Design a protein around this ligand. Structure first.
Ligand SMILES: Nc1ncnc2c1ncn2[C@@H]1O[C@H](COP(=O)(O)OP(=O)(O)O)[C@@H](O)[C@H]1O
Ligand SMILES: Nc1ncnc2c1ncn2[C@@H]1O[C@H](COP(=O)(O)OP(=O)(O)O)[C@@H](O)[C@H]1O
Ligand SMILES: Nc1ncnc2c1ncn2[C@@H]1O[C@H](COP(=O)(O)OP(=O)(O)O)[C@@H](O)[C@H]1O
Ligand SMILES: Nc1ncnc2c1ncn2[C@@H]1O[C@H](COP(=O)(O)OP(=O)(O)O)[C@@H](O)[C@H]1O
Ligand SMILES: Nc1ncnc2c1ncn2[C@@H]1O[C@H](COP(=O)(O)OP(=O)(O)O)[C@@H](O)[C@H]1O
Ligand SMILES: [K+]
Ligand SMILES: [K+]
Ligand SMILES: [K+]
Ligand SMILES: [K+]
Ligand SMILES: [K+]
Ligand SMILES: [Mg+2]
Ligand SMILES: [Mg+2]
Ligand SMILES: [Mg+2]
Ligand SMILES: [Mg+2]
Ligand SMILES: [Mg+2]
Lengths: 339, 339, 339, 339, 339
């Protein structure tokens, strides 16, 4: 009914990529241990300070229709990752942005983006198989504490509290988080009360505790892989083994291969160092060796406790790859007229 | 009641042709195996990515009144083709655009567009008779699988699932598509669950599965002709045999004869090659020989499985020809004032 | 109550004649066998393509108040002709435009437009008497078929269907038209189902079938005269016989005499030839000889079947003449201020 | 849903710092004995004249979205300090502004604001421990009178009335303030009636009496420290003893160390003298020696009666530090479009 | 002739003070060893980078008429100081700004600014007498080297070159500066060639060499006092000894007494430390002890070589005080209308 504006070819792709880049640049400043926070103005009260990828993504709406379409697709990526895992939304956002950019710049007159998407799906399936091959189950409560601490932005006390809750009520016991009226966090028999002074602080801490609980639930329901994005880096040889069916599938496989390095470079970049050199030295190093951004040095991640649930990284990669690959098949964009 | 703007002669025809060209150019980028997708912004939620001709056509509304009139007529073509067949909307759209363009360009002071329309109807009846003469019934389930795969953008798994459903519940059994909550497609006794990661992917896959089911229902209800637009190409000698009654009917017959080459040229164009040379080599080739765009070579279509239901192409040609021929008879266009 | 704008003399007449000319030029492109169609944008859905004079006239509303007054008067002419006959609206529109133009052009300081209107009424009464003298009753079903075919824009099948209906249910039997769900027209016992592919096509065909039914009902309720506007051309000697009472009545008689040639010239003009030469050759020819526009040659009207009901032409001439003659008497025009 | 504006890096930090500086500069003109008042226009009646920090803070709302975000955060600081103590809102506001300013000015590419916030929390915990170590309980009613007088802007009669009320109904007795209909303050058995001539005067006096009652309740529920900001100045050696864990924690500790001098400097500034010299001479002086701004000379605070509840200063420092340190971690600010 | 705008009272004073503050804030960032540079856009070529006070002052012209009047007066101060000394323009600018500010702030209905100006003149005469009493003549070439190095922004090579030139051509010999075509500075028999790479660098170095030569010429023509603004700080007791004749002269004497501390505070402020504490510790210290900003510690000025010509400081103080005191007598300002 309403009048529509139709955009063709690389112009619409460029506008959507600008929107995706804006949303992903806003989200990616909160990734890793040395990541900052984002203040979102709240209409009815005090602003909200958050380090969560999905919370930042869902709060960004753009005036331009095509940039808003791209932003909405990235929000879909982040929301799907949040609902199916509870953690890993920033990683999914950066992976989706990388895949979308790689697919957009590789579109030519003779290229077939549908077969590129197919090759992306096969590459992601291979990477997921490698990740499942590289997982190790959680056998000790210390691993649970390490996972909770890593997912709580390196907070020892949150991990200790979650480990105590899992010891008290069992590994599969019901655990919930409710805001506390005191300065410190406490545990009741499980119910977690979050300490703080203002509502913004308790909300940020509650978001981090919820992320830690979701991540440790995923880590106990599935295996454990290395942290820092190195688990995704170790799957490049799996893609090297695969053979393409045609040129477009080769393009998609190379897109996924280039994207697999993105989380580690983002984590290093937030730490103030050069991500490319860090990733190159990680790949040249041994399989057990990774990069600690908080300490800023190459260590053994299992010993240091830098580990991630394999479910979180698996679902983040899958959602980001699927949505971005579907996006790259675009040729025409139809939007409503901005009345 | 409301004030009206009245436009005469070739100016209104040019404006309506511009609207038709815009809508058809938006639609035609999704035709054939190497066709891209279209993102349509949704008012209430995430945008919709589709490769369906009728879905793209129905979502385009223009501000200019005359361009909107042309777009509405092309939307009528696409909607009628979708309702009476369930597939072939893009072919009907491109055929309607071609017929409208040729009819508009052949209008002179002494020309009679009504007799041109009559000649167009005679030519289309002859082509439909030839298509019915060239059909072959479906006798093996492998033909059903080939038809479903071709109508599902070359997806082997969709064709296999539909063939399994037809084996289990019979050729005339009740089959429906419902969105799945898992990663892969599954069959229940028939009900199809569509796999995916996000809603956009499952919606696109559901649209393709519905297209495949409608096309295979048409293919079992009627005969089978060659794919790739070659079946419509083989009917040119039938038009050569026909004799006109006057000059206007000859003009209409030549309009239909030139339009018959449009689908194959569009399919080749989406593949990144020159449509004219492909169509010429197809016409010089044997009757069984057609052009495979995915493989990009001249093959035997029945052996390779590039086949189409004759009902789909028949109704697409009929609807497009009727509506476009009625359009070409225009001399005056009356629209409402854009208050 | 509301503020009014008052216009005097030839300026208001010129504006009103501009409005009348616009509406009549829009309507007259659909007159005769070689007439085109008009697309009218519909607010709630798809546009409507029509060849009907009254349908085109009723859909034109002008922003300018005086042009809209003229257009409204021409719409009155067309609607009265449609209601009292069911056919002949385009002929009435062109006759009304011609009479209004000649009446406006012949107004001077000493001229009396009321006596000119009186002379117009006497001339039209004489022409109607001549038309009644020249009529011949319908005695054979072939005449019914010819009348239906002529009134259905030369469609043989519509005339055959209507003749079959009149044979089945009698000449005065109840016959109605309802839209069909199939490709071809069919008859039930009388109910007519109209075939087609899209709603626009069935609507145009329904309008033509309704026109044919109304025209054949008029032709069976009254006599038959020659088609192509020749019947109105044959009444000029009747006006030559008449003697005026004063100068103004002579002016009116000459206005009607010049207007009597309008329909044939319009039919020839839509055929792409010179109307003046065709009318002159018809007048120099024999009484039985007329001009076939579809064949583009001078033939015998009765033998070829180009015949019209006398009631349709009689009422079209009467309505057009009355309204236009009343129109030409204007000196002052009062309109509302365009707030 | 609504369109959002996203600002990155130091620009958003500068805008929020401008908003914070505006609100804190408005608030800080009312600190100390030589502080002025603020008139806030009331929509429904006469304006309100107040010397209360939270009342001034809550009444300032800025049009610019980022400045409004900063102002809202400072309002959160002031409101939390008012709710948890009843007094010390101006001190909390100035401390929060100072901490936010130093945190913003120390942000670099390699700096980690989260670890800076951690160091700030450690330093504040150390300062709170020192304040608890330096407290002395209230043992005499003269101390209650001194605390009430200090918190009532040096009003002897308010302190005398509150001391009489505490003698009559006990230290923990229920005491409330109600506006009086007479010129002078009176006490009933406890209910305080505030004297005055106009509603503005009685409102200002009621605000000061409520502040005095809350402060003396805190002073009787906890210990007593030196006034004039000297108690917060005496805790710098406690920070000197502390050792950092890394560079960012050292930055945070130095931020808190520099902030600890803010209240005394502001009190001196409102008195028309140089705050830096006063603070330096206070630090060089003995522990019991502080600066009397009303007398404008260095005296013994306990003997002169310049004392503060330790709870008020403790909670003001804690709230200001927490909220400001959370603010300094900002990198991206998302606001609504000013429609 | 041209229309005039007249401003009365404190509004014009505030506008002129804003202009003076703008110019002085621009100039004062280049004072002391830790002073930055100023880039002034040149109309005909590359911009000019300078650390010279008069060069920055003369390049600032304001659009507002009253601010431009204040800026023009400060430019007069700087130009007179440059012409009569060759050095000390920044000190004169900051002294003039301080005197103007205190004079403007101390104007009341009963105050007499003319007698305040008189008291300022007596105070400045007393300070000049103290400066002449505290001077010591140059007896060694090492003192010449120290003076040249101090006036050349601590450049050892410039001081060495100037000392060599004075050894070669005598203490009163003719010495000039000409731009060099080589990378390093050289001396010919005296002519100084300034090294560098581009014109901006050689221009900045030439300005510093000219400043050093003018300062050492003044230092040999007159005595030597302590650097860092300590020489002006040591004259406060001389003002303490003076007795006023009335209240306005006391106000002027206190204005000069407060202004005498400005250069040292500015030098400390440019070094990133608190000027008030540095000045207080300098005044509490011994007469020979001053503050080295480059080393950032309290040292012996004569031994370290931080010395200034007494003529430069004397003329800077005299010019600044005279012009600013004349300015403070303002009551009415008349400007031209900005056509
Ligand atoms: N100390 C550390 N050194 C290196 N990498 C780390 C460290 N702590 C966490 N990480 C990595 O940073 C990621 C956490 O980023 P986060 O902000 O939680 O993004 P998301 O919410 O998308 O998981 C984890 O994948 C983890 O591997
Ligand atoms: N591999 C192939 N090679 C050549 N032509 C193909 C191939 N696959 C499908 N086609 C042709 O492309 C058409 C399908 O286009 P499609 O996007 O479904 O348009 P529509 O929806 O109008 O049918 C079919 O008519 C088929 O003949
Ligand atoms: N083949 C023909 N040759 C010449 N005149 C024709 C022919 N067919 C129809 N006509 C004339 O054209 C007229 C029909 O015009 P039409 O579009 O029906 O206008 P209206 O609706 O006002 O009758 C009839 O009066 C008839 O005499
Ligand atoms: N005579 C005085 N000399 C020095 N400091 C004082 C004097 N009276 C009060 N103060 C200080 O001023 C502060 C009171 O400021 P106030 O306006 O109450 O701010 P707040 O409402 O935030 O406490 C107290 O902390 C007290 O230490
Ligand atoms: N190392 C130093 N430590 C302290 N003061 C210094 C040092 N070097 C120079 N100064 C002081 O800084 C002043 C030089 O400032 P400058 O930029 O030359 O201003 P101006 O051009 O007005 O003299 C001198 O008066 C000198 O006393
Ligand atoms: K994050
Ligand atoms: K399609
Ligand atoms: K007509
Ligand atoms: K206050
Ligand atoms: K300088
Ligand atoms: Mg996380
Ligand atoms: Mg299809
Ligand atoms: Mg008709
Ligand atoms: Mg108080
Ligand atoms: Mg100098």
């Amino acid at each position: 009914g309403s009048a529509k504006d139709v955009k063709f070819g690389a112009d619409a792709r460029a506008l959507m990529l600008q929107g995706v880049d804006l949303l992903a640049d806003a989200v990616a400043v909160t990734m890793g241990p040395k990541g900052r926070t984002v203040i979102i103005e709240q209409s009815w009260g005090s602003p909200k300070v958050t380090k969560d990828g999905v919370t930042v993504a869902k709060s960004i709406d753009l005036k331009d229709k095509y940039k808003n379409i791209g932003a909405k697709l990235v929000q879909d990526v982040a929301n799907n990752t949040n609902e199916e895992a509870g953690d890993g939304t920033t990683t999914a956002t950066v992976l989706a942005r990388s895949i979308a950019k790689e697919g957009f710049e590789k579109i030519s007159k003779g290229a077939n983006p549908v077969e590129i998407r197919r090759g992306v799906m096969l590459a992601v399936d291979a990477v997921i198989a490698e990740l499942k091959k590289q997982s190790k189950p959680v056998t000790t409560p210390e691993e649970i504490a390490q996972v909770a601490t890593i997912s709580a932005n390196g907070d020892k006390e949150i991990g200790n509290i979650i480990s105590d809750a899992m010891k008290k009520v069992g590994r599969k016991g019901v655990i919930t988080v409710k805001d506390g009226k005191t300065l410190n966090d406490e545990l009741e028999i499980a119910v977690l009360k979050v300490g703080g002074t203002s509502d913004v602080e308790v909300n940020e801490k509650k978001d981090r505790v919820t992320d830690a609980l979701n991540a440790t639930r995923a880590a106990v329901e599935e295996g454990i892989v290395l942290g820092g994005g190195c688990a995704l880096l170790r799957c490049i040889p799996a893609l090297d083994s695969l053979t393409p069916a045609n040129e477009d599938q080769k393009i998609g496989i190379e897109i996924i291969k280039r994207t697999l390095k993105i989380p580690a470079m983002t984590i290093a970049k937030n730490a103030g160092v050069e991500g490319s050199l860090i990733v190159e030295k990680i790949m040249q190093s041994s399989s057990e060796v990774g990069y600690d951004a908080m300490a800023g040095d190459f260590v053994n991640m299992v010993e240091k406790g830098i580990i991630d649930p394999t479910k979180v990284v698996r679902t983040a990669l899958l959602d980001a790859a699927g949505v971005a690959s579907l996006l790259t098949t675009a040729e025409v964009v139809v939007t409503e007229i901005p009345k």
